[PDB]
């Protein structure tokens, strides 16, 4: 019993990330944007964080940077872009438990979340 908190700058859409995770029995809680999650983060208990924000303006590396400046224990999975190396390297340098180069299928994302749900209890 743990929650997967997603954070994407993209419109809902019946078929993308959250709805997949929930079709697979996962407790999912979506968030409109980084600042929105940043402003709720203090109130999270037993959850895993899965970022994924494309635009370099507000990257997932900075969202991890800010969570570190509050001393929050949220095991994260920073989804990156196809062939984006420095970012995926920067994320592991920001406390990230893993990364996932896009595209990706259910399997890998589900697996990785479970390996993150270890760093909890």
From Swiss-Prot:
Binding site for Mg(2+): 8-9, 52, 54
Required cofactor names: Mg(2+)
Subcellular location: Cytoplasm
Record GO biological process: nitrogen fixation; phosphorelay signal transduction system; positive regulation of DNA-templated transcription
GO molecular function per UniProt: DNA-binding transcription activator activity; metal ion binding; transcription cis-regulatory region binding
Alphabetic keyword roster: Activator, Cytoplasm, DNA-binding, Magnesium, Metal-binding, Nitrogen fixation, Phosphoprotein, Plasmid, Transcription, Transcription regulation, Two-component regulatory system
Modification 4-aspartylphosphate occurs at: 52
Domain (Response regulatory) ranges: 3-117
Details of cofactor binding: Binds 1 Mg(2+) ion per subunit.
Superkingdom per UniProt: Bacteria
Cellular component, GO annotation: cytoplasm; protein-DNA complex
PTM summary: Phosphorylated by FixL.
Keyword Cytoplasm attributed: yes
Keyword Coiled coil attributed: no
Function: FixJ, when activated by FixL, induces the expression of both nifA, required for activation of classical nif and fix genes, and fixK, required for FixN activation.
This protein's name: Transcriptional regulatory protein FixJ
Organism: Rhizobium meliloti (strain 1021)
